[PDB]
Scaffold this motif. Structure first.
Motif, mmCIF file in Angstrom:
data_model
loop_
_atom_site.group_PDB
_atom_site.id
_atom_site.type_symbol
_atom_site.label_atom_id
_atom_site.label_comp_id
_atom_site.label_asym_id
_atom_site.label_seq_id
_atom_site.Cartn_x
_atom_site.Cartn_y
_atom_site.Cartn_z
ATOM 1 N N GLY A 1 -8.730 -10.459 -71.387
ATOM 2 C CA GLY A 1 -9.585 -9.971 -70.320
ATOM 3 C C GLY A 1 -9.622 -8.457 -70.255
ATOM 4 N N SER A 2 -10.487 -7.924 -69.397
ATOM 5 C CA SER A 2 -10.621 -6.480 -69.245
ATOM 6 C C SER A 2 -10.168 -6.036 -67.858
ATOM 7 C CB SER A 2 -12.072 -6.055 -69.480
ATOM 8 O OG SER A 2 -12.557 -6.554 -70.714
ATOM 9 N N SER A 3 -10.713 -6.677 -66.830
ATOM 10 C CA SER A 3 -10.368 -6.346 -65.451
ATOM 11 C C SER A 3 -9.041 -6.987 -65.056
ATOM 12 C CB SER A 3 -11.475 -6.807 -64.502
ATOM 13 O OG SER A 3 -11.746 -8.189 -64.667
ATOM 14 N N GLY A 4 -8.867 -8.251 -65.427
ATOM 15 C CA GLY A 4 -7.642 -8.958 -65.101
ATOM 16 C C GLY A 4 -7.542 -9.299 -63.628
ATOM 17 N N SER A 5 -6.511 -10.053 -63.265
ATOM 18 C CA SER A 5 -6.308 -10.454 -61.878
ATOM 19 C C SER A 5 -5.726 -9.305 -61.060
ATOM 20 C CB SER A 5 -5.378 -11.667 -61.807
ATOM 21 O OG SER A 5 -5.232 -12.120 -60.471
ATOM 22 N N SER A 6 -6.075 -9.263 -59.778
ATOM 23 C CA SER A 6 -5.592 -8.215 -58.887
ATOM 24 C C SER A 6 -4.156 -8.491 -58.453
ATOM 25 C CB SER A 6 -6.496 -8.103 -57.658
ATOM 26 O OG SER A 6 -6.534 -9.325 -56.941
ATOM 27 N N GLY A 7 -3.903 -9.717 -58.009
ATOM 28 C CA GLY A 7 -2.571 -10.088 -57.569
ATOM 29 C C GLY A 7 -2.457 -11.564 -57.243
ATOM 30 N N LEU A 8 -1.249 -12.103 -57.360
ATOM 31 C CA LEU A 8 -1.009 -13.513 -57.077
ATOM 32 C C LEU A 8 -0.262 -13.685 -55.757
ATOM 33 C CD1 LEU A 8 0.312 -14.037 -60.663
ATOM 34 C CD2 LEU A 8 -1.842 -15.051 -59.895
ATOM 35 N N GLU A 9 -0.984 -14.107 -54.725
ATOM 36 C CA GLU A 9 -0.388 -14.313 -53.410
ATOM 37 C C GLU A 9 -1.041 -15.491 -52.695
ATOM 38 O OE1 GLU A 9 -2.008 -13.486 -50.254
ATOM 39 O OE2 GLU A 9 -3.922 -13.268 -51.313
ATOM 40 N N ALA A 10 -0.286 -16.129 -51.807
ATOM 41 C CA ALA A 10 -0.790 -17.272 -51.055
ATOM 42 C C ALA A 10 -1.948 -16.864 -50.151
ATOM 43 C CB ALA A 10 0.327 -17.899 -50.234
ATOM 44 N N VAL A 11 -3.169 -17.031 -50.648
ATOM 45 C CA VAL A 11 -4.362 -16.681 -49.884
ATOM 46 C C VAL A 11 -4.947 -17.904 -49.188
ATOM 47 C CG1 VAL A 11 -5.851 -17.019 -51.884
ATOM 48 C CG2 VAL A 11 -6.644 -15.628 -49.957
ATOM 49 N N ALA A 12 -4.730 -17.995 -47.880
ATOM 50 C CA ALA A 12 -5.239 -19.114 -47.097
ATOM 51 C C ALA A 12 -6.388 -18.676 -46.195
ATOM 52 C CB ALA A 12 -4.121 -19.730 -46.269
ATOM 53 N N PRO A 13 -7.310 -19.609 -45.916
ATOM 54 C CA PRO A 13 -8.474 -19.341 -45.064
ATOM 55 C C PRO A 13 -8.088 -19.142 -43.601
ATOM 56 C CG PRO A 13 -8.360 -21.671 -45.596
ATOM 57 C CD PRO A 13 -7.288 -20.996 -46.407
ATOM 58 N N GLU A 14 -9.076 -19.232 -42.717
ATOM 59 C CA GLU A 14 -8.838 -19.062 -41.288
ATOM 60 C C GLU A 14 -9.944 -19.721 -40.470
ATOM 61 O OE1 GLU A 14 -8.638 -14.843 -42.635
ATOM 62 O OE2 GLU A 14 -9.783 -14.506 -40.790
ATOM 63 N N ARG A 15 -9.709 -19.857 -39.169
ATOM 64 C CA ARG A 15 -10.684 -20.473 -38.276
ATOM 65 C C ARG A 15 -10.400 -20.103 -36.824
ATOM 66 N NH1 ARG A 15 -8.768 -25.926 -41.376
ATOM 67 N NH2 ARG A 15 -6.823 -26.334 -40.229
#
Ligand SMILES: [Zn+2]
Ligand SMILES: [Zn+2]
Length: 60
Positions: A1-15
């Motif tokens: 890849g070129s850009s690659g991933s930004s970071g690995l973290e538990a990203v959960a939605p909201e309401r």
């Protein structure tokens, strides 16, 4: 890849949360859109308390 991933973290939605039963809301006050209500009924029951400040920042 070129850009690659930004970071690995538990990203959960909201309401939001109802203003009468405090339940997961999906729609907001069609009057001011500054409140949340799981169901129309609720938005009508809490009205007495909501309508108080309802119609805040007037807007289409
Ligand atoms: Zn509700
Ligand atoms: Zn309102």
């Amino acid at each position: 890849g070129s850009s690659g991933s930004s970071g690995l973290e538990a990203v959960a939605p909201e309401r939001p949360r109802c203003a009468y039963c405090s339940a997961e809301a999906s729609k907001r006050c069609s009057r001011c859109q500054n409140e949340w209500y799981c169901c129309r009924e609720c938005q009508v029951k809490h009205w007495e308390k909501h309508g108080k400040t309802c119609s805040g920042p007037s807007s289409g």
